Amino acid sequence: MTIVHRRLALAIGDPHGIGPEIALKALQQLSATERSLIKVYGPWSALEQAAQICQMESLLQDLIHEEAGSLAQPVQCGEITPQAGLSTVQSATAAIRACESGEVDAVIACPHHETAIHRAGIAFSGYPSLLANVLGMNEDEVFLMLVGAGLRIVHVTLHESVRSALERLSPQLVINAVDAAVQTCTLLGVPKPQVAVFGINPHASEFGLEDSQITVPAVETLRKRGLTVDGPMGADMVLAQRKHDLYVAMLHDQGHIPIKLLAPNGASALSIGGRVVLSSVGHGSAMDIAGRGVADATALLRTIALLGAQ
Amino acid sequence: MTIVHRRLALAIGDPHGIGPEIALKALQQLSATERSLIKVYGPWSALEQAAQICQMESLLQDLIHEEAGSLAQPVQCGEITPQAGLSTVQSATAAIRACESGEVDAVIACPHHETAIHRAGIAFSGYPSLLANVLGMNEDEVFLMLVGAGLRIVHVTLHESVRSALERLSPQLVINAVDAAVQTCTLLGVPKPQVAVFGINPHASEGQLFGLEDSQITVPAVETLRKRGLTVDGPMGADMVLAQRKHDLYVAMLHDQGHIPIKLLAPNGASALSIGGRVVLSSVGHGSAMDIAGRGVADATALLRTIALLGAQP
Ligand SMILES: NC(=O)c1ccc[n+]([C@@H]2O[C@H](COP(=O)([O-])OP(=O)(O)OC[C@H]3O[C@@H](n4cnc5c(N)ncnc54)[C@H](O)[C@@H]3O)[C@@H](O)[C@H]2O)c1
Ligand SMILES: [Cl-]
Ligand code: NA
Ligand SMILES: [Zn+2]
Ligand SMILES: [Zn+2]
């Protein structure tokens, strides 16, 4: 079973965490041809360390690697350090830039440690903010798509009060979300996606003017551009039908609830802006087991299978 | 075995619809003792008609019945008529009043037809509004609880714009919703539930990082409920709490927060309880089915399921 069919960047995350170890364990499971499609971004010293502990030194010769987030001192597994935090952001930044320039088609970031990044004096509020910052766009133009249990749901807004989200919603914002999400769908192996747009208000207002001002004009424009788009519709109703390859959530909770319920441990979070698709694996850096050789690479392999489709 | 363990009122709905027919088919499946706990409200003429079509005349002689929503003309199955609309509201009103007075412990309303009611000149926007109107309370003090697939979710607000819902949210509104929902839980066979309150904003505002609403509304409300001795968690992010699945009752601030989980897990299976004062009123999960009324082919499964839910052992 080949799971990688396109070029991918893998940023190895916090070099003191389990990110290095799971990168190797993942790459080990792949064939030689698959390995050559994955470019690893991170400090060599950490990959060396993990390879020694896990006894996978012979794998290192086959890795395609680019030095990023170099360390000035030896790797200290399990230790939260500002240096490690800087490393994480640099590795991820270099992967993103490689996707931006067309060297790879998508990026996977191994687990970061939020405290490490903060201690380096780096502002970080998630991959959507980082991706925007690196690509030099506004946070408004990078969207989060959750993928889990068959469902794909792009969020037009995220991480702000409901009132604040309502004030920012516009037809253009919804259109930009869908364009970004449709291009990502192509990458996930769905060329002609059937799109469903959630209503802002219950039953898509059939209960306020917001949908007539926002979601209705947006769907009209998308359809004129030749997209197959239904809605606005009541979130609850459309989801239940299970007739669509992509759903467009207006609000955080509309999109987050379905995914956490159906896919408690199988959900991917894709950050999407410009040409770039960045997934995390859905777990932390596990400092209590780092350097002890007990980390499993299942979540990383799942992320690779999803982004590596075709 | 027994699915009915307390007294219920059954309002038979639009008498031209399938409501009469499914009431009989349901009662047929129950034992004699169970049948004697269900008091049927509606026009006798419609039950007679349905009994003839379904060949259940001998069942009618056992039925506990109160005349409500009498008709002035023969039943015309399948036909939308104002008279039928008036009938529906009268039957349902009489069942509600029987629950209000303590004659029954809960109410089931069989399917109505919205057009019929409107043509009778009667304002109707759902059972929450009717229940409020009959009990003489405001629509703000009657709440909708969805039940399906182990989930129970009461909605603090319901069928209104998000903006409108946000403007009405207050600590007291949240408290009233929970009180109503807790008393209903007792009736559903879970006394003293473990309650989870959803946040208004994502992540329950994460303190105050994503708006002040939760600090002003859900936090003081939970504090008050806990001081009164209730086991209540939150506010928490809706998505997060639901995923845990370790609470008997959830409190949704907004329509979609509560409706999405239920339709996902229980695509058909979900009951909608209107709760006001001491009265709990469920619908059956379907319409009056005018196209098949009076042909004897309607399924009673949804009614039986509603009876099992409201009829549960204390
Ligand atoms: N309560 C109401 O508001 C109500 C009732 C009847 C009709 N209507 C009007 O007609 C539309 C559709 O309503 P509907 O009556 O078709 O119901 P529905 O949408 O709830 O159910 C779909 C169809 O399934 C069948 N069905 C439903 N319950 C059944 C049962 N117990 N046994 C066998 N078959 C059953 C009927 O043919 C029904 O038409 C509504 O959108 C409305 O405009 C409304
Ligand atoms: Cl490559
Ligand atoms: Na911190
Ligand atoms: Zn979130
Ligand atoms: Zn509804």
XYZ file of C-alpha atoms and ligand atoms in Angstrom:
672
model
C 0.000 0.000 0.000
C 1.533 3.299 -1.171
C 0.157 6.281 0.748
C 2.354 9.105 -0.667
C 1.726 10.212 -4.267
C 3.027 13.801 -4.215
C 5.870 15.828 -2.714
C 5.420 16.779 0.960
C 7.417 18.757 3.512
C 7.680 17.358 7.047
C 8.683 19.844 9.787
C 9.872 17.809 12.776
C 8.501 20.153 15.453
C 10.035 20.667 18.890
C 13.401 18.841 18.709
C 13.215 18.016 22.425
C 9.779 16.422 21.969
C 8.710 13.198 20.204
C 8.442 14.925 16.799
C 11.893 13.700 15.588
C 11.204 10.144 16.786
C 7.799 9.869 15.099
C 9.143 11.409 11.891
C 11.682 8.571 11.619
C 9.221 5.867 12.664
C 6.824 7.108 9.981
C 9.477 7.307 7.250
C 10.671 3.822 8.236
C 7.230 2.397 7.381
C 7.307 3.930 3.884
C 8.949 2.498 0.775
C 12.134 4.001 -0.691
C 10.140 5.783 -3.437
C 7.757 7.260 -0.861
C 10.691 8.383 1.300
C 12.085 10.355 -1.631
C 8.850 12.392 -1.864
C 9.105 13.583 1.750
C 11.538 16.394 2.502
C 12.266 16.669 6.240
C 12.854 20.132 7.742
C 14.593 20.406 11.090
C 17.925 20.182 12.963
C 19.975 17.181 11.894
C 21.260 16.816 15.459
C 17.793 15.900 16.722
C 17.190 13.335 13.976
C 20.610 11.841 14.780
C 19.693 11.659 18.478
C 16.342 9.982 17.818
C 17.856 7.549 15.302
C 20.398 6.413 17.913
C 17.812 5.872 20.644
C 15.483 3.992 18.261
C 18.375 2.188 16.465
C 17.432 3.531 13.023
C 20.799 5.039 12.012
C 20.758 3.369 8.577
C 17.522 5.220 7.753
C 19.296 8.621 7.946
C 21.273 8.062 4.732
C 17.990 7.802 2.764
C 16.289 10.892 4.193
C 15.854 13.945 2.037
C 16.640 16.700 4.510
C 17.092 20.446 4.755
C 18.754 22.004 7.785
C 16.398 24.382 9.580
C 16.061 25.430 13.221
C 19.677 24.564 13.977
C 20.561 24.260 17.654
C 23.640 25.770 19.280
C 23.745 23.120 22.027
C 23.073 19.347 22.247
C 19.522 18.013 22.197
C 18.033 17.610 25.699
C 15.058 15.284 25.316
C 12.160 16.177 27.611
C 13.357 19.725 28.371
C 11.301 22.812 27.579
C 13.815 25.410 26.309
C 13.479 28.678 24.325
C 16.075 27.383 21.832
C 13.825 24.404 21.120
C 10.911 26.777 20.633
C 12.754 28.878 18.072
C 13.795 25.662 16.317
C 10.141 24.605 15.967
C 9.063 27.854 14.326
C 12.082 27.953 11.991
C 11.561 24.355 10.809
C 7.899 25.046 10.174
C 8.635 28.364 8.457
C 11.108 26.667 6.104
C 8.584 23.963 5.182
C 5.907 26.574 4.511
C 8.292 28.573 2.275
C 9.082 25.391 0.322
C 5.363 24.864 -0.329
C 4.921 28.562 -1.230
C 7.687 28.297 -3.847
C 6.238 25.089 -5.360
C 8.989 22.723 -4.146
C 6.357 20.694 -2.260
C 2.559 20.405 -2.544
C 1.762 20.359 1.183
C 3.272 20.585 4.663
C 2.964 18.508 7.817
C 4.107 19.929 11.148
C 5.055 17.491 13.921
C 4.132 18.490 17.519
C 5.189 21.859 18.925
C 5.404 22.955 22.558
C 3.514 26.204 23.191
C 5.529 27.102 26.299
C 8.834 26.685 24.469
C 7.741 29.021 21.688
C 6.437 31.628 24.171
C 9.696 31.530 26.155
C 11.592 32.315 22.921
C 9.574 35.550 22.828
C 7.612 34.365 19.790
C 3.894 35.117 19.485
C 2.012 31.967 18.473
C -1.734 31.332 18.514
C -1.884 28.317 16.182
C -0.812 27.268 12.692
C -3.373 29.556 10.926
C -1.677 32.613 12.457
C 1.833 31.302 11.706
C 0.916 30.460 8.112
C -0.526 33.942 7.588
C 2.525 35.554 9.182
C 5.006 33.620 7.005
C 3.036 34.136 3.759
C 2.539 37.829 4.661
C -1.288 37.776 4.575
C -3.954 38.670 7.161
C -5.329 36.035 9.545
C -8.710 36.686 7.860
C -7.452 35.163 4.570
C -6.196 31.871 6.083
C -8.897 29.336 6.894
C -9.063 26.231 9.068
C -10.520 23.080 7.522
C -11.300 20.188 9.878
C -11.278 16.742 8.303
C -12.646 13.723 10.134
C -14.923 10.722 9.594
C -15.768 11.570 5.980
C -16.624 15.190 6.847
C -14.695 18.173 5.525
C -15.643 21.521 7.073
C -14.009 24.872 6.377
C -14.534 27.661 8.924
C -15.216 31.148 7.615
C -14.457 32.519 11.094
C -12.672 30.997 14.085
C -11.571 31.937 17.611
C -13.490 35.108 18.287
C -16.748 35.932 20.021
C -19.888 35.058 18.096
C -20.770 38.773 17.971
C -17.327 39.623 16.606
C -17.632 36.841 13.986
C -21.011 38.180 12.838
C -19.599 41.699 12.408
C -16.779 40.372 10.184
C -18.826 38.022 7.991
C -19.255 39.355 4.448
C -20.039 37.708 1.038
C -16.394 38.082 0.008
C -15.077 36.416 3.175
C -17.355 33.415 2.530
C -16.243 33.237 -1.127
C -12.555 33.324 -0.172
C -13.119 30.532 2.340
C -14.775 28.343 -0.274
C -12.159 29.026 -2.974
C -9.397 28.068 -0.536
C -11.370 24.991 0.574
C -12.139 23.870 -2.998
C -8.477 24.058 -4.040
C -7.604 22.002 -0.952
C -10.260 19.458 -1.936
C -8.436 18.906 -5.241
C -5.336 18.086 -3.187
C -7.332 15.657 -0.983
C -8.484 13.742 -4.105
C -11.903 15.318 -4.787
C -11.776 17.420 -8.019
C -15.487 18.362 -8.468
C -16.647 18.911 -4.843
C -20.317 19.291 -3.897
C -20.380 22.184 -1.435
C -22.913 22.947 1.302
C -22.989 26.398 2.918
C -24.322 26.552 6.497
C -26.739 29.304 7.440
C -25.684 31.894 10.011
C -29.100 31.835 11.682
C -31.245 28.739 12.435
C -32.844 27.093 9.363
C -30.776 29.526 7.272
C -33.147 32.332 8.417
C -36.038 31.006 6.243
C -35.140 34.722 11.673
C -32.925 37.668 10.660
C -31.481 39.281 7.536
C -27.876 38.067 7.873
C -28.222 35.143 5.436
C -29.898 37.279 2.726
C -27.007 39.757 3.038
C -24.135 37.261 3.324
C -24.579 33.588 2.460
C -27.193 33.953 -0.301
C -25.191 36.438 -2.508
C -22.057 34.347 -1.909
C -23.656 31.120 -3.116
C -25.096 32.971 -6.125
C -21.603 34.227 -7.061
C -19.963 30.807 -6.547
C -22.614 29.114 -8.713
C -22.112 31.708 -11.488
C -18.382 30.828 -11.370
C -19.444 27.220 -12.041
C -19.296 25.609 -8.587
C -21.951 23.114 -7.437
C -23.134 24.833 -4.247
C -26.207 24.304 -2.096
C -27.488 26.575 0.640
C -27.592 28.417 2.817
C -29.125 25.513 4.745
C -29.623 24.608 8.385
C -26.366 23.045 9.550
C -28.143 20.180 11.343
C -30.244 19.288 8.290
C -27.506 19.262 5.634
C -24.987 17.337 7.753
C -27.615 14.635 8.354
C -28.165 14.110 4.588
C -24.462 13.297 3.990
C -24.611 14.404 0.342
C -21.687 16.866 0.219
C -17.898 16.655 0.046
C -17.347 20.001 1.744
C -19.316 22.020 4.288
C -18.808 25.705 4.981
C -19.258 26.676 8.631
C -19.908 30.306 9.497
C -18.915 29.865 13.151
C -16.402 27.925 15.200
C -18.925 25.739 17.039
C -20.957 24.807 13.943
C -17.900 23.114 12.451
C -16.115 21.885 15.568
C -19.038 19.982 17.104
C -19.621 17.446 14.261
C -15.929 16.596 13.962
C -15.157 16.084 17.664
C -18.251 13.871 17.966
C -17.758 11.513 15.026
C -13.937 11.509 15.009
C -12.720 11.909 18.635
C -9.231 10.653 17.697
C -9.156 10.778 13.862
C -9.490 14.481 13.062
C -7.021 16.460 10.946
C -6.771 20.261 11.093
C -5.636 21.820 7.803
C -4.554 25.468 7.716
C -5.097 26.804 4.175
C -3.780 30.022 2.622
C -2.461 30.796 -0.838
C -1.202 27.543 -2.379
C -0.190 26.182 1.014
C -1.880 23.432 2.981
C -0.446 22.781 6.445
C -1.682 19.954 8.653
C -0.644 19.133 12.172
C -0.777 15.660 13.637
C -3.426 16.091 16.313
C -1.310 15.653 19.442
C 1.318 17.272 21.643
C 5.067 16.877 22.018
C 4.767 14.411 24.935
C 7.817 15.610 26.889
C 7.352 12.851 29.516
C 8.147 10.119 26.944
C 10.533 12.043 24.687
C 13.836 10.228 24.299
C 12.416 7.011 25.798
C 11.498 5.376 22.485
C 7.770 4.750 23.116
C 6.075 7.120 20.666
C 3.790 5.723 17.967
C 3.644 7.299 14.495
C 0.042 6.334 13.651
C -1.272 9.902 13.784
C 1.513 11.157 11.534
C 0.972 8.305 9.040
C -2.741 9.135 8.962
C -1.950 12.795 8.191
C 0.474 11.754 5.435
C -2.129 9.398 3.903
C -4.658 12.242 3.823
C -2.395 14.860 2.214
C -0.606 12.291 0.046
C -3.697 11.095 -1.842
C -4.054 9.832 -5.427
C -42.831 -6.050 29.008
C -43.893 -2.676 30.415
C -43.016 0.618 28.701
C -45.620 2.788 30.531
C -45.067 3.428 34.256
C -46.929 6.725 34.762
C -50.085 8.471 33.562
C -49.960 10.125 30.124
C -52.310 12.304 28.091
C -52.370 11.593 24.358
C -53.761 14.378 22.138
C -54.647 12.741 18.816
C -53.708 15.720 16.629
C -55.320 16.708 13.345
C -58.308 14.317 13.112
C -58.008 14.239 9.309
C -54.350 13.164 9.593
C -52.800 9.891 10.799
C -52.808 10.921 14.476
C -56.018 9.005 15.391
C -54.834 5.907 13.529
C -51.387 5.808 15.156
C -52.920 6.413 18.586
C -55.000 3.234 18.221
C -52.204 1.174 16.671
C -49.939 2.218 19.553
C -52.519 1.468 22.248
C -53.153 -1.919 20.608
C -49.496 -2.892 21.197
C -49.704 -2.072 24.926
C -51.104 -4.335 27.648
C -54.489 -3.665 29.257
C -52.821 -2.166 32.374
C -50.678 0.135 30.229
C -53.722 1.219 28.209
C -55.435 2.333 31.406
C -52.583 4.802 32.108
C -53.112 6.631 28.796
C -55.974 9.130 28.567
C -56.795 10.043 24.952
C -57.945 13.583 24.111
C -59.738 14.276 20.851
C -63.000 13.857 18.889
C -64.568 10.455 19.351
C -65.800 10.550 15.743
C -62.223 10.433 14.446
C -61.205 7.582 16.746
C -64.352 5.708 15.642
C -63.453 6.253 11.996
C -59.856 5.096 12.479
C -60.974 2.068 14.517
C -63.267 0.967 11.688
C -60.580 1.282 9.013
C -58.009 -0.537 11.199
C -60.593 -3.079 12.523
C -59.911 -2.143 16.157
C -63.480 -1.369 17.280
C -63.133 -3.614 20.344
C -60.184 -1.502 21.511
C -62.348 1.639 21.773
C -64.528 0.108 24.482
C -61.422 -0.110 26.741
C -60.002 3.325 25.974
C -59.891 6.064 28.540
C -61.128 9.084 26.616
C -62.151 12.704 27.040
C -64.049 14.539 24.303
C -62.106 17.527 23.000
C -62.044 19.249 19.609
C -65.464 17.930 18.589
C -66.228 18.087 14.881
C -69.438 19.422 13.391
C -69.202 17.286 10.232
C -67.925 13.785 9.266
C -64.178 13.153 9.265
C -62.653 13.675 5.808
C -59.311 11.878 5.973
C -56.609 13.623 3.951
C -58.387 16.992 3.744
C -56.936 20.212 5.126
C -59.850 22.051 6.795
C -60.057 24.895 9.361
C -62.384 22.777 11.530
C -59.682 20.094 11.733
C -57.205 22.796 12.733
C -59.369 24.053 15.576
C -59.842 20.437 16.682
C -56.066 19.930 16.942
C -55.567 22.975 19.173
C -58.522 22.095 21.411
C -57.358 18.478 21.872
C -53.852 19.607 22.703
C -55.082 22.377 25.016
C -57.224 19.860 26.932
C -54.299 17.467 27.365
C -52.053 20.276 28.573
C -54.683 21.407 31.105
C -54.966 17.822 32.388
C -51.206 17.745 33.012
C -51.333 21.239 34.592
C -54.009 20.032 37.051
C -52.070 16.858 37.968
C -54.453 14.390 36.290
C -51.563 13.140 34.106
C -47.769 13.391 34.462
C -46.931 14.196 30.818
C -48.415 14.884 27.388
C -47.861 13.530 23.905
C -49.271 15.481 20.953
C -49.832 13.515 17.735
C -49.134 15.326 14.428
C -50.742 18.677 13.596
C -51.116 20.423 10.225
C -49.861 24.020 10.225
C -52.074 25.144 7.337
C -55.212 23.810 9.006
C -54.475 25.732 12.194
C -53.691 28.968 10.319
C -56.930 28.708 8.307
C -58.907 28.477 11.575
C -57.483 31.928 12.366
C -55.311 30.527 15.156
C -51.751 31.771 15.681
C -49.392 28.810 16.087
C -45.592 28.792 15.946
C -44.920 25.449 17.651
C -45.733 23.646 20.891
C -43.522 25.976 23.030
C -45.751 28.934 22.114
C -48.976 26.939 22.592
C -47.816 25.580 25.950
C -46.923 29.082 27.130
C -50.237 30.476 25.928
C -52.311 27.777 27.650
C -50.335 27.943 30.933
C -50.391 31.768 30.793
C -46.593 32.239 30.839
C -44.188 34.023 28.445
C -42.505 32.145 25.585
C -39.184 32.960 27.314
C -40.095 30.632 30.237
C -40.852 27.566 28.066
C -37.846 25.614 26.798
C -37.170 22.973 24.169
C -35.260 19.847 25.183
C -34.087 17.466 22.439
C -33.570 13.819 23.389
C -31.890 11.232 21.177
C -29.216 8.510 21.343
C -28.376 9.079 25.025
C -28.015 12.862 24.528
C -30.312 15.291 26.322
C -29.935 18.975 25.419
C -32.058 21.882 26.642
C -31.932 25.088 24.586
C -31.780 28.399 26.445
C -32.844 30.153 23.225
C -34.392 28.636 20.125
C -35.817 29.801 16.795
C -34.406 33.282 16.378
C -31.456 35.063 14.838
C -28.129 34.512 16.564
C -27.930 38.264 17.235
C -31.398 38.260 18.786
C -30.484 35.246 20.955
C -27.320 36.950 22.217
C -29.264 40.073 23.217
C -31.702 38.023 25.313
C -29.220 35.747 27.093
C -29.040 36.528 30.834
C -27.980 34.542 33.975
C -31.622 34.124 34.999
C -32.647 32.755 31.583
C -29.902 30.111 31.813
C -30.958 29.177 35.372
C -34.613 28.798 34.387
C -33.686 26.570 31.461
C -31.651 24.285 33.728
C -34.333 24.099 36.454
C -36.951 23.149 33.848
C -34.597 20.599 32.254
C -33.580 19.030 35.586
C -37.203 18.463 36.632
C -37.847 16.890 33.226
C -34.834 14.618 33.695
C -36.435 13.247 36.865
C -39.460 12.334 34.739
C -37.265 10.672 32.068
C -35.769 8.370 34.729
C -32.522 10.198 35.591
C -33.072 12.002 38.945
C -30.281 14.352 40.018
C -28.424 14.554 36.653
C -24.872 15.632 35.887
C -25.290 18.845 33.913
C -22.930 20.558 31.456
C -23.402 24.211 30.417
C -22.139 25.201 26.958
C -20.282 28.468 26.481
C -21.770 31.212 24.324
C -18.456 31.939 22.587
C -15.830 29.405 21.384
C -13.898 27.759 24.244
C -16.368 29.414 26.636
C -14.575 32.732 25.838
C -11.286 31.291 27.241
C -11.655 33.536 30.261
C -12.196 36.828 28.406
C -9.978 36.323 25.356
C -12.924 35.832 22.978
C -15.543 38.208 24.411
C -17.092 39.061 27.779
C -20.396 37.216 27.307
C -19.549 34.057 29.275
C -18.071 35.943 32.260
C -21.291 38.020 32.386
C -23.820 35.246 31.697
C -22.869 31.569 31.960
C -20.270 31.843 34.740
C -22.554 33.655 37.302
C -25.375 31.251 36.371
C -23.329 28.135 37.066
C -22.045 29.734 40.295
C -25.662 30.336 41.422
C -26.797 26.803 40.454
C -23.865 25.249 42.350
C -24.536 27.397 45.456
C -28.121 26.054 45.352
C -26.588 22.563 45.478
C -26.763 21.396 41.842
C -24.011 19.399 40.098
C -23.203 21.618 37.098
C -19.975 21.896 35.105
C -18.906 24.723 32.772
C -19.170 26.920 30.925
C -17.180 24.730 28.539
C -16.695 24.701 24.781
C -19.680 22.863 23.322
C -17.483 20.748 21.018
C -15.239 19.650 23.896
C -17.904 18.660 26.437
C -20.058 16.769 23.930
C -17.004 14.736 22.873
C -16.417 13.514 26.466
C -19.950 12.042 26.762
C -19.995 12.064 30.584
C -23.074 14.174 31.356
C -26.781 13.344 31.467
C -27.900 16.804 30.381
C -26.386 19.600 28.290
C -27.445 23.228 28.226
C -27.167 24.818 24.774
C -27.075 28.600 24.480
C -28.007 28.625 20.774
C -30.210 26.597 18.436
C -27.430 25.098 16.301
C -25.216 24.129 19.254
C -27.918 21.726 20.427
C -29.515 20.697 17.135
C -26.347 19.565 15.352
C -25.257 16.810 17.813
C -28.771 15.340 17.982
C -29.438 15.134 14.228
C -25.980 13.565 13.748
C -26.229 10.766 16.325
C -30.002 10.225 16.082
C -31.016 11.030 12.469
C -34.448 9.551 13.201
C -34.925 8.740 16.854
C -34.973 12.274 18.292
C -37.783 13.517 20.556
C -38.538 17.202 21.119
C -39.910 17.996 24.583
C -41.538 21.355 25.293
C -41.159 22.131 29.004
C -43.059 24.737 30.998
C -44.155 24.667 34.623
C -44.883 21.058 35.590
C -45.874 20.148 32.025
C -43.758 18.099 29.634
C -45.128 17.841 26.089
C -43.524 15.743 23.374
C -44.395 15.581 19.728
C -44.016 12.520 17.586
C -41.171 13.178 15.162
C -43.234 13.420 11.977
C -46.101 15.232 10.257
C -49.788 14.442 9.744
C -49.120 12.542 6.483
C -52.280 13.647 4.693
C -51.427 11.526 1.619
C -51.822 8.239 3.554
C -54.422 9.270 6.133
C -57.404 6.973 6.378
C -55.869 4.071 4.425
C -54.718 2.117 7.495
C -50.987 1.987 6.586
C -49.424 4.425 9.082
C -46.571 3.339 11.324
C -46.882 3.766 15.095
C -43.210 3.147 15.923
C -42.462 6.836 16.501
C -45.413 7.215 18.877
C -44.427 4.058 20.798
C -40.889 5.403 21.130
C -42.213 8.721 22.524
C -44.410 6.810 25.000
C -41.430 4.676 26.107
C -39.406 7.845 26.706
C -42.032 9.739 28.729
C -43.344 6.581 30.392
C -40.016 5.529 31.937
C -39.690 4.010 35.440
C -38.982 6.805 38.005
N -46.881 19.238 11.356
C -46.775 19.929 10.228
O -46.255 21.046 10.168
C -47.215 19.304 8.950
C -47.953 18.134 8.893
C -48.329 17.636 7.667
C -47.962 18.291 6.511
N -47.244 19.459 6.564
C -46.851 20.140 5.309
O -46.434 19.125 4.388
C -44.991 19.054 4.350
C -44.519 17.637 4.601
O -45.248 17.004 5.708
P -45.601 15.414 5.714
O -46.975 15.233 6.292
O -45.362 14.824 4.352
O -44.517 14.772 6.749
P -42.938 14.500 7.048
O -42.085 15.426 6.239
O -42.726 14.544 8.528
O -42.718 12.980 6.547
C -42.452 12.633 5.154
C -43.503 11.663 4.663
O -43.319 10.382 5.317
C -44.570 9.757 5.515
N -44.783 9.515 6.940
C -44.573 10.360 8.004
N -44.890 9.830 9.162
C -45.358 8.562 8.849
C -45.856 7.496 9.631
N -45.972 7.522 10.952
N -46.229 6.365 8.987
C -46.099 6.311 7.653
N -45.646 7.240 6.815
C -45.292 8.356 7.480
C -45.643 10.663 4.910
O -46.007 10.352 3.585
C -44.962 12.028 4.970
O -45.545 12.911 4.019
C -44.493 20.120 5.347
O -43.307 20.751 4.878
C -45.666 21.106 5.482
O -45.672 22.183 4.551
C -46.866 19.975 7.786
Cl 11.072 16.381 -2.190
Na 2.271 29.633 27.950
Zn -10.928 26.112 18.763
Zn -35.645 23.725 14.863
